[PDB]
Structure 1
Amino acid sequence: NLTEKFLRIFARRGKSIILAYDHGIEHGPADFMDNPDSADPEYILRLARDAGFDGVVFQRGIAEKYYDGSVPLILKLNGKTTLYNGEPVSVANCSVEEAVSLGASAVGYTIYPGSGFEWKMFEELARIKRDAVKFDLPLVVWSYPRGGKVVNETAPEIVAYAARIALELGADAMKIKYTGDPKTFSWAVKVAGKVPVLMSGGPKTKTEEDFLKQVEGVLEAGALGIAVGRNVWQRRDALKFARALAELVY
């Protein structure tokens, strides 16, 4: 049971905070200008350790050059850039076997349901899922419907669809976008069934209070917790705010 392994490692207190840091490929270093220390992966690991968070998410290159075993690692296997303009697609730049050798306790993979290339990711996810079982590493699916008929990505029915697809394809945990309110988000949590749901943190909010409120409703909806990047490390008071998030979530 890989969900149970995931919960044991990443949610020992019953809830989870994962510090996400795949943004260097997905968005590029413009994300790091607000708080320049955020460009240094060593600063990120220190933030995770000092705030008492459960994990970090790195791409293979960051894991290879910087990962030191100090916080449980989810190795994000695929990645794309915002420079890309086609139908959404993100392919693996790392195998599960290599993730294991880099010290990962879980692997991550993004799918874009609805994309003209949805099939390419489902096909590749099949191989990754099989390897995840073989190496006994939980699979965490970033389920982000995009392209095709998707217009609003945070619409209640799209997020619920995202959650269900991750369950159906074999996710042991999932990361999905927040709908903006606990009632509609709890439907997504419900259709995910036994698979725990992490809220994606999203763009830095106008105030810290706005994000604490989002996180409050995420927990009320029954989610396991949050996978947060920008709303922590884009802030110059990153550590202070991270510890307030820890207080709220645990």
Structure 2
Amino acid sequence: ELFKDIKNLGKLVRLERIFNRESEKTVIVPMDHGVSNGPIKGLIDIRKTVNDVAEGGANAVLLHKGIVRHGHRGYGKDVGLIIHLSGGTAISPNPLKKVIVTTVEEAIRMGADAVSIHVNVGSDEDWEAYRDLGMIAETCEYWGMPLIAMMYPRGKHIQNERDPELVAHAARLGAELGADIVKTSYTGDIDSFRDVVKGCPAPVVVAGGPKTNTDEEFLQMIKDAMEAGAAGVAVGRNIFQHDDVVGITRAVCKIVHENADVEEALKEIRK
């Protein structure tokens, strides 16, 4: 079993709604860009992007409390709901600054299945975030709320945010502080990323990154990441900014849940 070591009935129950019973993997679609980047392609009509993506395979979605109270359909099949707790914007005089904008209690009373926090390890006064992650991890432990920690090496003195050692360190940091799952950048090659995965006691979900050149490159990255040990993927733009949202997620699901090869999943992108 994947989480067969966590002493928390509540966490298990809720983790069951974000991971696939059979594959023990997960396909999460982050849709929180509205806060940091503003209205972007694909995130204007949330209910559309959400319902589709669900129809395409996704296990759960990532959203800010302000947007949940809206994009609720309860129509098509159901996907897990992860509420983001961090805030920060590009237009801010310090883009890397992240602050807690939502409480764990708020998320649970909204019916969320998990909460996520973003930590830019290496940014100015990032230690304040260490404390945040640490304290939030505790309230999460109490409420039986699964916590996803998105750890990224970003700051003034960091040129390569994908450096293997830094990413491995950041991921471990999140597990050490109490996160149940860790989100982070793929290092570029199967071997270095495998180090990130083996160096972190908690399941690691890989980030998709900016919109890729070809669906083959993108789908290949995910394939490699999985073969390295990832417990799933958390793709945003590469999915909802695609021409065929339903199809592209189908591909991702094929690769992640069915171990299907790239050449195959690629035939799902029906125009």
* TM-score tier after normalising by the smaller chain length: over 0.9
* Unmatched segments (≥5 aa) in structure 2: 1-5, 258-271
Offset of residue 156 of structure 1: 1.1
Say if 2:123 is the partner of 1:118. Answer: no
Offset of residue 87 of structure 1: 6.9
Residue equivalent to 1:210 = 217
Q: Deviations over 1:60-113 (max 9, x none)?
A: 101122245631111001111111232722111110000011111100001111
**Cα RMSD (Å) of the superposition?**
1.6
Residue equivalent to 2:269 = none
- Within 5 Å, which residues of 2 pair with 1:147-186? 147-186=155-194
- Within 5 Å, which residues of 2 pair with 1:93-242? 93-193=101-201, 195-242=202-249
SS of structure 2 residue aligned to 1:94: coil
AA aligned opposite 1:232: I
Decide which of 63, 67, 72 is 2:68's aligned counterpart. 63
AA aligned opposite 2:217: D
Aligned residues: 244
Decide which of 24, 34, 37 is 1:27's aligned counterpart. 37
Runs of 4+ with >6 A deviation: none
AA aligned opposite 1:184: S
Q: Deviations over 1:170-219 (max 9, x none)?
A: 110010011111111110000112x1111011000000001110001000
Residue equivalent to 1:40 = 45
- Within 5 Å, which residues of 2 pair with 1:56-95? 56-68=61-73, 70-86=78-94, 88-95=96-103
Offset of residue 47 of structure 1: 2.0
Q: Deviations over 1:20-61 (max 9, x none)?
A: 1011112222x31xx5xx311101221232012110000110
Offset of residue 149 of structure 1: 2.7
SS of structure 2 residue aligned to 1:39: coil
SS of structure 2 residue aligned to 1:107: strand
Residue equivalent to 2:262 = none
TM-score by length of 2: 0.85
1 or 2, which has the higher helix percentage?
A: 1
Aligned mates of 1:223, 1:119 — CA distance in 2: 27
Task: Give the % identical residues.
Answer: 36
Say if 2:16 is the partner of 1:11. Answer: no
Q: Deviations over 1:143-182 (max 9, x none)?
A: 0121143221011111111111111111100100111111
TM-score by length of 1: 0.92
SS of structure 2 residue aligned to 1:65: coil
* Unmatched segments (≥5 aa) in structure 1: none
